[PDB]
Amino acid sequence: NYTFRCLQMSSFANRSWSRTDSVVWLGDLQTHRWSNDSATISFTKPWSQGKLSNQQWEKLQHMFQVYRVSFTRDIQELVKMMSPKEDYPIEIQLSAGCEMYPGNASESFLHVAFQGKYVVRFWGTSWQTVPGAPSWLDLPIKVLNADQGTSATVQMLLNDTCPLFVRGLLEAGKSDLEKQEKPVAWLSSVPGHRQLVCHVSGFYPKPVWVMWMRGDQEQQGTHRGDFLPNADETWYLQATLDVEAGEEAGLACRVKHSSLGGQDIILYW
Amino acid sequence: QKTPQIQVYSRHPPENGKPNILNCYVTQFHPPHIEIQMLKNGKKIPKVEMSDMSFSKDWSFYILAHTEFTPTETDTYACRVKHASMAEPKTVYWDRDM
Numbered sequence: 346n347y348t349f350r351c352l353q354m355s356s357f358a359n360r361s362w363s364r365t366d367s368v369v370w371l372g373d374l375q376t377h378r379w380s381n382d383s384a385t386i387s388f389t390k391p392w393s394q395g396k397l398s399n400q401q402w403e404k405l406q407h408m409f410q411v412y413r414v415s416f417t418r419d420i421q422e423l424v425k426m427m428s429p430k431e432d433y434p435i436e437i438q439l440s441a442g443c444e445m446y447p448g449n450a451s452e453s454f455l456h457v458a459f460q461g462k463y464v465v466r467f468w469g470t471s472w473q474t475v476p477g478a479p480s481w482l483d484l485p486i487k488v489l490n491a492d493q494g495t496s497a498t499v500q501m502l503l504n505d506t507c508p509l510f511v512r513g514l515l516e517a518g519k520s521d522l523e524k525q526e527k528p529v530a531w532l533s534s535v536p537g538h539r540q541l542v543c544h545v546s547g548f549y550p551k552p553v554w555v556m557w558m559r560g561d562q563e564q565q566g567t568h569r570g571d572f573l574p575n576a577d578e579t580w581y582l583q584a585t586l587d588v589e590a591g592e593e594a595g596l597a598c599r600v601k602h603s604s605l606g607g608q609d610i611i612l613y614w
Numbered sequence: 615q616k617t618p619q620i621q622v623y624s625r626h627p628p629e630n631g632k633p634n635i636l637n638c639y640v641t642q643f644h645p646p647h648i649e650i651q652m653l654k655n656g657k658k659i660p661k662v663e664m665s666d667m668s669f670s671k672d673w674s675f676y677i678l679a680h681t682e683f684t685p686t687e688t689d690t691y692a693c694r695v696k697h698a699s700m701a702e703p704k705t706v707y708w709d710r711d712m
């Protein structure tokens with residue numbers, strides 16, 4: 346039930362400067378990186394080769410190495426031929442991969458952003474511009490669609506290569522994907538009102554429950570912030586409650602998480 | 615063009631005198647070209663590590679910097695970000711709590 350994302354980031358400053366850097370994710374765990382100054386893709390997990398042989402992995406890498414060069418050349422040529430007539434700088438982002446649904450068929454995707462906006466996808470057997478994209482973009486897409494070889498390769502990669510590779514990843518990365526890491530929590534406040542803050546860090550996987558409580562009564566005015574990453578791929582979340590002077594006494598932060606085994610953290614102000 | 619947002623927070627409960635890791639999570643900026651420093655008493659910390667830049671489902675970029683630090687009652691910590699969307703570097707101070 347994981348989404349596998351190959352995230353490519355390409356910047357074209359002028360005719361003589363571009364770089365392309367990619368990162369690859371299974372769920373919220375990073376499996377690969379490929380920086381512009383490396384010839385080869387790096388594994389960021391022990392299990393990033395999945396169930397592929399050294400030989401199968403080399404052939405797949407080779408295909409991407411050819412791609413990176415061709416993509417760079419093709420974009421610059423397309424821009425040179427287009428509107429508003431060679432328009433550096435150019436920013437392109439590409440998001441490709443597959444969503445696994447145990448029991449059924451994976452769903453694949455290849456989406457492309459240009460100058461920060463989603464404009465193009467590969468759909469079925471060809472490229473298409475998406476509603477509201479700049480109309481001129483229809484022209485390079487028509488051009489791209491004349492390339493039968495590339496369309497056959499993209500269909501292979503999305504329909505076959507991606508779910509086969511990912512299935513292997515899921516099996517080979519099982520222990521990391523199912524790791525439990527425990528939250529640790531601490532309290533602070535900023536100030537007649539004050540905001541109590543419960544900081545919760547180091548948990549994995551992502552799903553958590555954090556509430557300010559008074560005894561068994563949930564304080565529903567509790568506000569949870571965004572999930573913020575730790576360097577070690579665990580998570581951080583804060584939960585705040587606005588209280589009046591004097592109300593703090595008898596409140597606690599309570600956290601539930603899969604890793605705790607039903608033993609909640611309860612920290613009383 | 616989009617302005618970076620900056621959150622600064624600790625890996626473990628900040629206790630004065632105890633080695634910890636301070637994070638600076640920078641998001642929502644565009645274009646991806648960015649410079650990020652973490653500061654102790656206004657001075658660049660040379661041991662800052664940078665995760666790989668990535669982007670979210672909604673196309674916005676993000677990156678995480680982090681550094682070993684020992685919080686104390688006399689040291690301030692900050693993350694300073696330079697980006698074409700801002701005339702000045704944006705500096706956000708650790709709130710000493712996060």
Ligand SMILES: CCCCCCCC/C=C\CCCCCCCCCCCCCC(=O)N[C@@H](CO[C@@H]1O[C@H](CO)[C@H](O)[C@H](OS(=O)(=O)O)[C@H]1O)[C@H](O)/C=C/CCCCCCCCCCCCC
Pocket residue numbers: 351352353367369377379386405408409411412413415416419420423424427439441442457459465485492493494495496498499502503506507510
């Ligand atoms: C994808 C899931 C697979 C799982 C693998 C997991 C491991 C991943 C690890 C790292 C991944 C790195 C991130 C990359 C993200 C995936 C990108 C998908 C695109 C791959 C396309 C592969 C095909 C390819 O390289 N095409 C290239 C080579 O074409 C070939 O050229 C040959 C001569 O040079 C021949 O013409 C050949 O024809 S044939 O008859 O001889 O066969 C033909 O197939 C082709 O040049 C590249 C095309 C670019 C496709 C990308 C289009 C981007 C969207 C366009 C928007 C443009 C907007 C701006 C325009 C001004």
Ligand SMILES: *[C@@H]1O[C@H](CO)[C@@H](O)[C@H](O)[C@H]1NC(C)=O
Pocket residue numbers: 358359361362
């Ligand atoms: C292209 O752009 C880069 C900015 O990223 C800059 O170093 C340079 O001025 C340009 N390259 C040349 C020398 O034309």
Ligand SMILES: *[C@@H]1O[C@H](CO)[C@@H](O)[C@H](O)[C@H]1NC(C)=O
Pocket residue numbers: 362363364365381382
């Ligand atoms: C990115 O790598 C390509 C392919 O080797 C190289 O030609 C290009 O100069 C690199 N870009 C930068 C900015 O180093």
Ligand SMILES: *[C@@H]1O[C@H](CO)[C@@H](O)[C@H](O)[C@H]1NC(C)=O
Pocket residue numbers: 469470500501504
């Ligand atoms: C890949 O899947 C699409 C439907 O999602 C289909 O139209 C296309 O024919 C498929 N290609 C191959 C080679 O299986």
